Design a protein around this ligand. Structure first.
Ligand SMILES: C[C@@H]1NC(=O)N[C@@H]1CCCCCC(=O)O
Ligand SMILES: C[C@@H]1NC(=O)N[C@@H]1CCCCCC(=O)O
Lengths: 594, 594
């Protein structure tokens, strides 16, 4: 008995009471004579409320009967004010129904009789829910703006409709227009509502924010309304001059940039689950913005921070390729003949000769891990991937390094399990740096594979080495040497080598786990390659393959700008103050036309 | 603080000084009364220079104010001559601004007052740089030809505009027109400028070359301007006769052929990084040219030179399959039990019985290598691949043969390393010979794979044989025989055989290197195959797959014609001298129309 089933039952139940009540039936059928033979002579009590708490006038307004409505208003002018007392339509008056149906004569008549232009239809039907086919708001002015009836709109303002009115979701009439399907026609209606504003700079209707802190301009970008966005952009751009085909226009660049508490358009576009907002970046005030962010400041800091990461990880493996080794003191090798451990645990490290060199290497692996946690853990409190899952991996990597540290200081046997996870987590997070025209697009996506593949093998050969650095190399000796390890793992990448298989000997728990993940990633990269080899030249889907990368580059650029300090990464555009336009920062864009 | 940021600041700074200076503001706002209330009565000093070193007339010219400009010229006729004293617009007069905006009345008025039609706008904005949205030149005549205003063009010639004028890049008005987006409309403007030429055969405006030695016709081909190219081709073709649908036209074929110092159109098309010029080859005077070059002379000499290469390489392997062998004199085999060398060094060669047969074979491998260097090393001094990287490989191959020679005469142990590189470099450079309708296109690209694959295995099986010709065949005996070697390497091509793997035995350094390159090339050829199997029938992209090969065939044809001597490869077309048209060589082309 879902909700809907209820309204399905009520809509059927409404038509039943309309069938049953002759006053309500006559109001529906527009039976003029039957309304006089009922109201004037032993006529039913007028204030009848139907199945949906509707009056006879409500029914008269629903079906566009003006003759029958006018009879009901002259016999009982009280009704006009009565709202729908039902739960589905709590607050809806006969004026709401008259406005939506674009019954100008009935609207004009109800306004004559003094209908409330401020009545809030707070019924459950009018809620902004995916199970409601329309969302127009609460006030009757808001209904007229959505049906596109400019006649009713001004006719409502003439009778004192407050354009600043907000509904239960803190949405002005401007917010609701941007949430409408007919975008190209709502632009016209949007200008009509702005004309009736107070005409004052202060308390502007375009500035009144959503209950979720969204001005209509900002909501247009988050909702992916291209038509309303470009239209709203006209009010906030200034043409400096026109030199032949060139047009140097100056953009406002205010609500489209940082230093919103978190309120940047850019941050709202990259963090929303609306794909449709992906396209807002690509508009002519915004695309120029992020491309300049990325050219200088963006691309260099990414490669610098990336190169630092490359060194911080190659140092971690430098400490892993040479980790403390002990012999199999134990004779237990002889029992469990399957066992092939030459197990190493050592706390002989303190006395040091080529041991201290690692220690400072291990110390770097720790101070970098906490630094990683010092910049990402305070960031989860204030979560989307577009960039890629770099942040999820970068914290779990430092988690494994800290565990391996806590694994040490206890001389625990399972040192390998958390230490091996950090190897793949560390390196595979390197190929996220990979971020730094159909053919050129074939070669572009191919170099990303060569980048991702060499990165994967440098994390799994590193891992596979540790897995078998303890075990006997006479049986299952694929990785006796890092150099071999690399070359074996490389060949294992392409299925050329029957991967490391033994069955008489009990191989450690890690291999059967680390190799299973290696076998999957190696095929996905070989599958992500084929799609990049066909998908590039198969259609203009390449562009689809394309923005996504550009959208990822933008998502990364916004990330860099959040922690990097103010001294680095200066603000975009040019500030306006002396030069004399100014507190807002402006972007200078010039375009050629042909 | 990039350059651009500067001009972004200056354009904002200009509008500030315009805001600040009432004379400059009135010149912008076209305030006629405010210009009289300032110049006639205690008016500001006129020769005010703005933020961009601009006069009030410059500002008056920028925004199309004629009433305000006429006031400034009658109150101070001096201004007309003043150029922009700024660095961004050094040299720009008010006439330049009037010409671009197509303000005929202001142009006519400035010419009345005697404006310089030879003023060079040498500012940094007007430079031919990718960060400038337009490039029109320096002189005001050159501005009018680019905006398409034929009225201003002739109006400038009437006042003595030199059509032969060249800018800082040695570009005539003809050169600049070909560098314009609107190609179909610039053809019309191009004819208007030619009419005012001296009318003499000598000192023709179409013959005045670029500062980079490019006539406008030649520049059209290098820039890939199809519309200007076909248009300029009309002036240099002659219709012999018309026999029904047939039309035997005779083409000039002068600036489109060799014996330019290096100045052939063809050499300029094949060596430029402009893809767009790829399409110039395919025009109806040029496509007929290269196809005749290729049919006879081109295709045969390529196969002849190719067959010679095939023999010169099969001889090098003939000396490599049977190279001096010595035993492991040393007991060192017993130490380093991993070592599996039956190492051969010998200087017993001099005494000879089936040894001399190789020596003359080795001697051929040397005289051919220097001959290779005798034809490519003097060619680097006077670098693009289209043909493919054949030249880069052919020199490094001879480099390895010379090293192997220097490796000999020293009895060095590492003989194998440079000698094995020459094997793959020699053979894989053979499949460049591969150069010699969707389905037929499927079978066409498939035979190139069968050509490239058999060539690859004949270079790596040759290499793998040498790598294990010294090592023990009882362990890792994939290549004990060239015949086996071939068959193993063939199977290793298709991943059928777990490639040569051993871990108890220390395999030589080369295998882990030569096999890694074999594993990559074998997959790319199996990936270049799939794209040729789908890409052929997936769309008319096959053509895209297609010209590229035709463009490579043309690039190879131009290569052959450079070193081959004059006695071979006669000149294309027919010479004109008695027959009596002549010093230029002409190509006879007849076309049917339907
Ligand atoms: C037709 C019903 N009868 C009536 O008197 N009011 C209702 C109007 C239906 C509108 C439902 C709008 C929505 O889907 O939210
Ligand atoms: C508008 C500026 N003000 C002015 O007096 N001259 C400038 C003209 C701008 C042209 C820039 C051409 C280019 O991009 O190179």
């Amino acid at each position: 008995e879902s909700w809907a089933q209820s309204r399905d039952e009520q809509n059927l139940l409404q038509q039943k009471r309309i069938w049953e009540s002759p006053l309500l039936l006559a109001a529906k059928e527009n039976n003029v004579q039957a309304l006089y033979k009922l109201l004037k002579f032993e006529g039913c009590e007028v204030h009848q409320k139907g199945a949906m708490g509707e009056t006879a006038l409500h029914i008269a307004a629903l079906y566009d009967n003006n003759e029958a409505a006018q009879v009901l208003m002259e016999a009982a002018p009280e009704l006009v004010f009565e709202p729908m007392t039902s739960e589905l339509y709590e607050g809806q008056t006969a004026l709401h129904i008259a406005v939506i149906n674009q019954n100008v004569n009935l609207v004009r008549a109800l306004l004559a009789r003094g209908a409330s232009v401020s009545a809030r239809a707070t019924g459950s039907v009018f809620h902004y829910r995916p199970h409601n086919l329309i969302y127009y708001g609460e006030h009757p002015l808001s209904f007229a703006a959505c049906v596109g009836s400019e006649e009713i709109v001004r006719l409502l303002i003439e009778h004192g409709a407050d354009i600043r009115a907000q509904d239960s979701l803190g949405n002005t009439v401007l917010h609701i227009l941007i949430l409408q399907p007919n975008k190209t026609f709502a632009c016209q209606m949007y200008n009509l509502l702005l004309s009736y504003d107070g005409g004052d700079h202060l308390k502007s209707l375009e500035l009144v924010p959503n209950n979720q802190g969204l001005t209509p301009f900002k909501l247009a970008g988050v909702e992916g309304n291209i038509v309303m966005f470009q239209h709203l952009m006209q009010k906030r751009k200034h043409i400096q001059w026109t030199y032949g085909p060139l047009t140097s226009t100056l953009y406002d660049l205010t609500e489209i940039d940082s230093s919103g508490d978190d309120q940047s358009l850019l941050e709202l576009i990259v963090t929303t689950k609306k794909r449709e907002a992906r396209q807002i970046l690509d508009q002519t005030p915004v695309k120029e913005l992020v491309s300049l962010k990325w050219k200088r400041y963006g691309r260099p800091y990414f490669c610098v921070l990336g190169a630092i990461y490359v060194l911080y990880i190659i140092c971690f493996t430098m400490c892993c390729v040479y980790r403390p080794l002990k012999p199999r003191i134990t004779n237990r090798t002889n029992p469990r003949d399957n066992t092939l451990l030459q197990q190493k645990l050592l706390q002989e490290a303190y006395v040091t000769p080529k041991d201290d060199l690692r220690l400072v290497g291990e110390l770097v692996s720790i101070v970098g891990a906490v630094i990683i946690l010092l910049v990402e853990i305070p960031d989860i409190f204030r979560q989307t991937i577009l960039g890629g899952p770099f942040h999820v991996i970068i914290v779990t990597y430092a988690f494994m390094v800290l565990v391996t540290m806590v694994m040490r200081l206890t001389n625990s046997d399972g040192e390998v399990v958390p230490m091996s996870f950090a190897l793949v987590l560390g390196w595979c997070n390197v190929m996220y740096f990979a971020r730094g025209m159909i053919q050129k697009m074939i070669f572009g996506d191919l170099m990303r594979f060569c980048w991702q593949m060499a990165v994967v093998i440098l994390g799994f050969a590193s891992a596979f080495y540790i897995i078998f650095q303890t075990e006997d190399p006479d049986e299952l000796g694929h990785f006796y040497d890092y150099p071999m390890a690399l070359f074996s793992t490389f060949e294992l990448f392409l299925t050329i080598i029957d991967g490391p298989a033994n069955y008489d000997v009990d191989l450690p728990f890690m291999y059967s786990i680390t190799y299973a993940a290696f076998a999957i990633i190696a095929t996905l990269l070989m599958l992500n390659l084929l799609i990049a080899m066909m998908g590039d030249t198969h259609w203009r889907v390449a562009h689809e393959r394309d923005e996504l990368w550009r959208a990822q580059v933008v998502a990364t650029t916004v990330m860099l700008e959040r922690k990097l300090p103010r001294c680095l990464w200066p603000r975009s555009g040019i500030c306006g103050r002396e030069y004399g336009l100014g507190d807002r920062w402006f972007l200078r864009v010039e375009d050629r036309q042909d």
